[PDB]
Design a binder for this molecule. Structure first.
Ligand SMILES: CCCCCCCCCCCCCCCCCC(=O)OC[C@H](COP(=O)([O-])OCC[N+](C)(C)C)OC(=O)CCCCCCCCCCCCCCCCC
Ligand SMILES: CCCCCCCCCCCCCCCCCC(=O)OC[C@H](COP(=O)(O)OCCN)OC(=O)CCCCCCCCCCCCCCCCC
Ligand SMILES: CCCCCCCCCCCCCCCCCC(=O)OC[C@H](COP(=O)(O)OCCN)OC(=O)CCCCCCCCCCCCCCCCC
Ligand SMILES: CCCCCCCCCCCCCCCCCC(=O)OC[C@H](COP(=O)(O)OCCN)OC(=O)CCCCCCCCCCCCCCCCC
Ligand SMILES: C[C@H](CCC(=O)O)[C@H]1CC[C@H]2[C@@H]3[C@H](O)C[C@@H]4C[C@H](O)CC[C@]4(C)[C@H]3C[C@H](O)[C@]12C
Ligand SMILES: *C(=O)CCCCCCCCCCCCC
Lengths: 165, 88, 12, 166, 71, 122, 81, 128, 127, 62, 171
């Protein structure tokens, strides 16, 4: 989580700085082209946050939901976890649509310039981490439990489906 | 924070550049020392939305007490420049 | 266009 | 055991070097933000060596170097627990901080007190690595409260903003 | 702020870009899909299933020891 | 799963009780069930520092896997052959737990049938 | 340096979705005298912005190219040794 | 048409929805003249000292002094022991002391028995 | 509601003063008048060497900066720590406790040469 | 309006509306901008509680 | 108070900004901004002050029931994310009198100009007092507006802090 969650804040830092200290997404938009590199990380992180397969988030969040479903547990608590995962995509998309897609709602005179090498490098490293961190960590940490592989078809991809919905 | 400053010429150009895009005043007759209620024939409700388009350009609100005292484009330049400490 | 930044006396 | 123990404490001692130098030893006001970033950069490399040795042989050890206090039948020692949890979070926390440190050089460039800002961020990291590596509850509580207070000082960074103090 | 380029702010136009800015942005995005597609190939099991789930109803009383009702 | 309704919105004795299983004797139902064996030994599991929850019959494949991780370092993109051996054995062990569950589920119904027949007729 | 404000007469509500608003305002005896002021947003480089699916597919064109070559190359490697 | 606004202690009635800001009688507007008349007089008195270049120190604010003197040193001379002050004093002052005494006394009496009887777990308890 | 003639006059009277005031808040070419800050020999030498761009000698300069940093921040501290741990901490009981290494069936012990039996044979499986 | 002469030691200190300082005119030229006070103005008995940091009595949407 | 003309003008500005918050997209806002303008255009003039108030009170009730719970706020306005963000950098000017001479010598030009302002401020103070006690009723001023200088060479009364106030972005 630390990898892509840290990246998301930095990406939003570029947008806030570029728009002259503007944080309300209702005065943003049309940044998919103006800020491509910031856009790439803002989307890469948003996909890792929602749990796209084989990114950093998948190797932790998906395993959790599989274990939560197939474990002696509180039924209502389990439901809220599944509902929340779906709710993750809704506000995650809210950011992209109201900041990247659509048409620019920011004032006329703006200074969009996401080219400072510090800004690119700082975002770039977490972008690499945001994609490969989960795979590296999972394949190296020694096991200490008995992860459950066998399960019903509807409890192995439940996390992916609810996110898609 | 890397934002270029504002000059007196830059402020004046943008103030007129927004009014000139307003479909209620003749651009040829639009002068910096041109009233809004006594020369260009505009109602107060039009004046209020004159400020909104003005605020959304400079990105900072104007108090309603001091908003209903800007009846000339020059006075807008004085107010915007004075608030943001523009001198040259 | 460097301007003068007013600060409290930092000598003491 | 000699390399693992040494390279696991050098990571913590390195982070304290920039704050020690604040006692007007080496005066580099215009480069202090870059000084701290480099220190975090080297801390990550050093912390990886203990991490790899754990990934290989599953080696874990506890260092109780200093005997601080003994209350009758309770011996309080400054103990560090370099285990599964500690050895994996330290590289990740440093790695993310490295990226955040470089980002702050650009984002906070116009801040008059950027040196103070980079000191407070470094103070938090030290108190967090005390929390992560703590081996007894009292030492864990030092970091527990340490991060809490540094959070107070950084949220209220713009102390003129009444809503920041709130 | 310290360094970077010097792209001037367009008054009402689309902001200027730079070569390296666009190339790097599109490079990683292309790497995200290669990594997903490449990973989805070798270990599709982790995203669809590891081993088939036994169906209890398709079993026989001989392999479960259900005695005959006689005794 | 799918039997929760059969446990709450339906009959109770039809569905087993996970906290109390097994209920019926361990031999009644099969012709001299072969006792499950364990390839590993206590001294071997103890010296491998296997977690207690891993001290199951599926062990002796985890021990093989752990050796590959230490003997192939750094080859974390490897040793997948031993990963499936232990995982597969774990998969079979889980099946038996379901097989234990399915056995218990029917024997309760069989007890229902036998009691129902003798009770209803008399 | 001076800020060369573009020509103010190039921002035309014609050919933009702001025109559809004008049409639906004419059908009730009303006009909105600000469409030209907001016209700069839908034209220029800001026109034809991608869709939500179009953004998530960014880079897939080049990424899919790498995937096809990689899998085929690996298959060749398997047979060789 | 729309539901009215319910004003609470911590939610004042919006001035727009207050049915007194619209009607402006001769006397109602006259009062607002005195309020601005006095408050503009003080604004003048403050600005005379504030802007003076021959004044270094603190402009003593008699309103501030009256505030602190009323909050600390003028309370007791205006105190009368009556039903409210006496009943509030006993409840706030003595109630908590009596409540806490029985919570702790009852708790410790119960715990004391379990130790004499040997029914309290103190296997590793050697720090008190 | 517009400005009364007196109000607008006062603003212009002040507006000219403020613009004059903000103009005075500017630094002359000499200011700030720094004192005679001497430069150490290392500082002056690098300035001359860094005059020309010469990319090839900026990697070397970067290496020098990192070499000094890696010496006063990674090498001296580790010497102090290793000296501290090896001769003051390890000389007291249980100060440094390391989890015993994992032994697997079929290993060789370096301390005594013992060879634990490999394992019992497995019921060979597949899949 | 004096406080009620109920004997809690209020004396003749004026009773002002229980309105926080957060709901005062932000744009008016206050002598104490952070406190939203005017020099020489009578201070609320509970001014310290109603400062812009502690208690807000502003109207809410609901 | 605020007359009756001003209240409707203030309500119109709030209604548009709250409407601008719901709409977000500019094209929608223009479509509804003029519609809301029309509803004001319907009841312009219309005299009948008694009925005029009824329309405003109904307007305020409708605005309150339909206002956005989280209206957009300018970053540097009361409620904004950058309101007073630089108040900690705003140091008054009287602190410069407390500077040590060794650090005034770093700015010989700046403090040369300050003496002119301080010299100017002292000489003009007496006239400013006269300018204020002549243009003021017997019962003290009844408004916060100040008169300008009724002469050439006289600065406006009470100008020192208005003119010399800290800059908006002092650092
Ligand atoms: C046994 C547990 C401990 C019990 C004691 C602690 C319980 C809380 C009792 C003390 C609360 C009051 C603290 C003193 C006042 C200082 C804070 C204040 O004045 O308000 C400022 C802030 C108000 O800030 P705000 O962000 O909510 O909004 C203020 C208005 N603006 C935004 C415009 C500036 O209030 C608080 O932070 C107090 C909230 C915590 C108290 C409620 C605790 C609930 C716990 C549920 C479990
Ligand atoms: C309870 C947990 C929480 C407690 C936290 C309380 C706050 C503490 C603040 C941080 C303090 C840092 C602690 C690490 C530094 C240890 C200081 C030290 O070395 O003390 C001397 C120590 C010997 O002390 P010791 O063996 O423990 O005897 C009992 C003492 N009570 O070591 C020695 O024998 C001397 C070692 C000398 C070798 C190094 C010399 C080279 C370096 C010199 C330049 C530096
Ligand atoms: C997950 C587990 C943890 C969950 C934690 C969260 C649990 C939250 C539970 C729900 C909380 C809802 C709030 C309930 C308390 C409401 C009390 C209240 O409303 O009193 C306010 C009181 C009103 O009085 P007044 O303003 O004069 O009249 C209002 C008429 N409109 O004005 C006053 O303040 C007077 C004092 C009243 C004291 C009431 C007791 C409090
Ligand atoms: C136990 C305490 C019981 C207190 C309740 C009984 C007092 C009472 O009800 O009021 C009696 C009397 C007021 O009666 P009344 O005639 O209505 O008013 C006076 C008119 N001249 O009251 C009086 O006039 C005189 C005051 C009566 C004595 C009150 C003293 C006890 C209350 C103060 C509590 C002190 C708390 C100390 C805190 C310790 C630290 C926690
Ligand atoms: C190595 C680092 C950046 C080098 C680079 O450009 O990559 C540079 C930036 C500023 C330097 C530091 C500052 O000069 C302050 C310290 C004084 C001496 O230079 C040595 C240690 C000292 C702590 C330096 C170590 C190193 O040379 C630093 C940290
Ligand atoms: C058993 O433990 C199931 C508990 C509920 C978790 C799964 C909920 C989601 C089920 C979706 C598939 C339903 C069949 C169409």
């Amino acid at each position: 989580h630390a990898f892509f969650k840290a990246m998301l804040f930095m990406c939003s830092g570029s947008i806030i700085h570029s728009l002259n200290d503007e944080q309300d997404i209702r005065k943003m938009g049309g940044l998919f082209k103006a800020m491509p590199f910031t856009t790439t990380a803002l989307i890469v992180g948003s996909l890792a946050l929602t749990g796209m397969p084989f990114l950093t988030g998948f190797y932790s969040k998906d395993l959790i939901i599989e274990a939560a479903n197939t474990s002696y547990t509180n039924a209502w608590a389990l439901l809220m976890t599944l509902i929340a995962t779906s709710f993750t995509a809704i506000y995650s998309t809210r950011i992209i649509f109201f900041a990247l897609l659509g048409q620019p709602r920011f004032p006329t005179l703006v200074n969009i310039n996401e080219n400072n090498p510090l800004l690119i490098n700082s975002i770039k490293r977490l972008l690499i981490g945001s994609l490969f961190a989960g795979y590296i960590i999972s394949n190296n940490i020694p096991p200490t439990t008995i992860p459950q592989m066998t399960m019903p078809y509807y409890l192995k991809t439940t996390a992916l489906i609810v996110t898609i919905l | 924070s890397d934002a270029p400053p504002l000059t007196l010429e830059g402020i004046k150009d943008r103030v007129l550049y927004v009014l000139k895009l307003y479909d209620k005043i003749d651009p040829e007759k639009l002068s910096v020392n041109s009233h809004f209620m006594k020369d260009l024939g505009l109602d107060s409700l039009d004046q209020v939305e004159i400020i909104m388009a003005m605020e959304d350009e400079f990105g900072f609100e104007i108090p309603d007490i001091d908003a209903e005292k800007l009846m000339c484009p020059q006075e807008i330049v004085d107010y915007i420049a004075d608030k943001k400490d523009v001198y040259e | 266009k460097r301007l003068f930044i007013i600060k409290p006396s930092g000598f003491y | 055991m000699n390399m693992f123990s040494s390279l696991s404490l050098v990571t913590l001692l390195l982070l304290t070097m920039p704050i020690m130098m604040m006692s007007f030893n080496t005066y580099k006001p215009s480069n202090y933000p870059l000084y701290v970033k480099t220190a975090i950069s080297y801390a990550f490399i050093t912390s990886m060596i203990p991490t790899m040795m754990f990934i290989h042989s599953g080696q874990e050890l506890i260092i109780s170097n200093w005997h601080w206090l003994t209350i009758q039948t309770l011996k309080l020692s400054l103990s560090f627990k370099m285990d599964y949890f500690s050895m994996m979070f330290i590289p990740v926390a440093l790695f993310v901080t490295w990226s955040i440190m470089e980002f702050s050089m650009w984002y906070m460039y116009s801040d008059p007190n950027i040196n103070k800002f980079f000191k407070y961020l470094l103070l938090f990291l030290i108190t967090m690595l005390i929390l992560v590596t703590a081996n007894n509850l009292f030492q864990l509580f030092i970091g527990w409260e340490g991060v809490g207070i540094m959070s107070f000082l950084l949220i209220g960074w713009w102390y003129g903003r009444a809503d920041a103090n709130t | 702020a310290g360094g970077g380029a010097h792209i001037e702010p367009r008054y009402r136009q689309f902001p200027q870009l730079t070569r390296s800015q666009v190339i790097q942005a599109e490079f990683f995005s292309a790497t995200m899909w290669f990594w997903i597609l490449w990973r989805f190939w070798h270990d599709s099991d982790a995203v669809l299933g590891h081993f088939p789930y036994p169906d209890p109803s398709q079993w026989t009383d001989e392999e479960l020891g259900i005695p005959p009702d006689d005794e | 799963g799918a039997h929760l309704a059969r446990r709450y919105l339906g009959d109770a004795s039809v569905e087993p009780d996970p906290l109390r299983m097994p209920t019926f004797p361990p031999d009644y139902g099969f012709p001299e069930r072969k006792e499950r064996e364990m390839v590993a030994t206590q001294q071997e599991m103890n010296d491998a520092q296997l977690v207690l929850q891993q001290r199951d019959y599926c062990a002796h494949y985890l021990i093989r896997f752990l050796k590959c991780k230490r003997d192939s370092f750094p080859n974390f993109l490897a040793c997948k052959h031993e990963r499936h051996d232990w995982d597969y054995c774990e998969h079979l062990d889980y099946v038996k737990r379901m097989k234990e569950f399915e056995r218990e589920r029917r024997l309760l119904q069989r007890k229902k049938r036998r009691e129902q027949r003798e009770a209803d007729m008399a | 340096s001076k800020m060369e404000l573009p020509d103010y007469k190039q921002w035309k509500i014609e050919g933009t979705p702001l025109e559809t608003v004008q049409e639906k305002l004419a059908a009730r005896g009303l006009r909105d005298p600000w469409g030209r002021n907001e016209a700069w947003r839908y034209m220029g480089g800001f026109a034809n912005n991608v869709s939500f699916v179009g953004a998530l597919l960014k880079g897939f064109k080049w990424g899919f190219a790498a995937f096809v070559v990689a899998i085929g190359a690996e298959y060749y490697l398997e047979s060789q040794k | 048409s729309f539901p009215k606004y319910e004003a609470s202690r911590l939610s004042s009635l919006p001035t727009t929805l207050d049915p007194a800001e619209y009607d402006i009688s001769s006397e109602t507007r006259k009062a607002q003249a005195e309020r601005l008349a006095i408050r503009s007089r003080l604004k003048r008195e403050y600005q005379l000292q504030y802007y003076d270049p021959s004044r270094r120190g603190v402009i003593e604010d008699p309103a501030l002094v009256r505030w602190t003197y009323a909050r600390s040193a003028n309370i007791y001379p205006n105190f009368r022991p009556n039903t409210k002050t006496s009943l509030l004093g006993a409840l706030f002052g003595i109630g908590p002391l009596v409540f806490w005494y029985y919570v702790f006394k009852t708790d410790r009496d119960r715990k004391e028995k379990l130790i004499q009887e040997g029914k309290l777990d103190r296997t590793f308890n050697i720090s008190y | 509601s517009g400005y009364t003639p007196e109000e607008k006059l006062r603003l212009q009277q002040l507006r000219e003063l403020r613009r004059r005031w903000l103009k005075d808040q500017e630094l002359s070419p000499r200011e700030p008048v720094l004192p005679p800050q001497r430069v150490s020999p290392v500082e002056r030498f690098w300035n001359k060497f860094l005059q020309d761009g010469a990319l090839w000698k900026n990697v070397i300069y970067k290496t020098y900066r990192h070499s000094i940093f890696a010496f006063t921040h990674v090498l001296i501290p580790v010497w102090i720590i290793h000296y501290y741990l090896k001769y003051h901490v390890t000389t007291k009981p249980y100060t440094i406790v390391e989890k015993k290494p994992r032994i697997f069936p079929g290993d060789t012990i370096l301390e005594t040469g013992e060879v634990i039996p490999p394992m019992k044979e497995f019921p060979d499986q597949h899949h | 309006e004096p406080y009620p002469d109920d004997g809690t030691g209020y004396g003749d200190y004026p009773k002002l509306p229980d309105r926080s300082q957060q709901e005062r005119d932000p744009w008016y030229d206050w002598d104490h901008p952070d406190l939203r006070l005017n020099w020489g103005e009578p201070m609320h008995w509970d001014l310290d509680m109603y400062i812009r940091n502690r208690v807000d009595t502003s109207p809410t949407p609901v | 108070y605020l007359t009756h003309q001003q209240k409707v003008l203030r309500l119109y500005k709030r209604a548009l900004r709250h409407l601008e918050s719901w709409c977000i997209h500019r094209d929608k806002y223009r479509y509804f901004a003029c519609l809301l303008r029309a509803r004001f255009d319907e009841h312009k003039n219309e005299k009948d002050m008694v009925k005029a108030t009824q329309l405003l009170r109904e307007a305020e009730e409708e605005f309150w029931h339909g206002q956005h719970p989280q209206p957009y706020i300018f970053p540097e306005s009361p409620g904004g994310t950058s309101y007073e963000r630089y108040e900690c950098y705003k140091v008054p000017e009287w602190c410069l009198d407390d500077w040590h001479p060794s650090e005034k010598a770093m700015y010989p030009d700046y403090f040369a100009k300050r003496e002119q302002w301080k010299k100017l401020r002292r000489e003009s103070w007496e006239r400013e007092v006269k300018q204020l006690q002549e243009e003021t009723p017997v019962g003290g001023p009844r408004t916060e507006a100040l008169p300008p200088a009724r002469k050439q060479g006289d600065l406006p009364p009470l100008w020192w802090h208005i003119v010399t106030r800290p800059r908006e972005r002092p650092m």
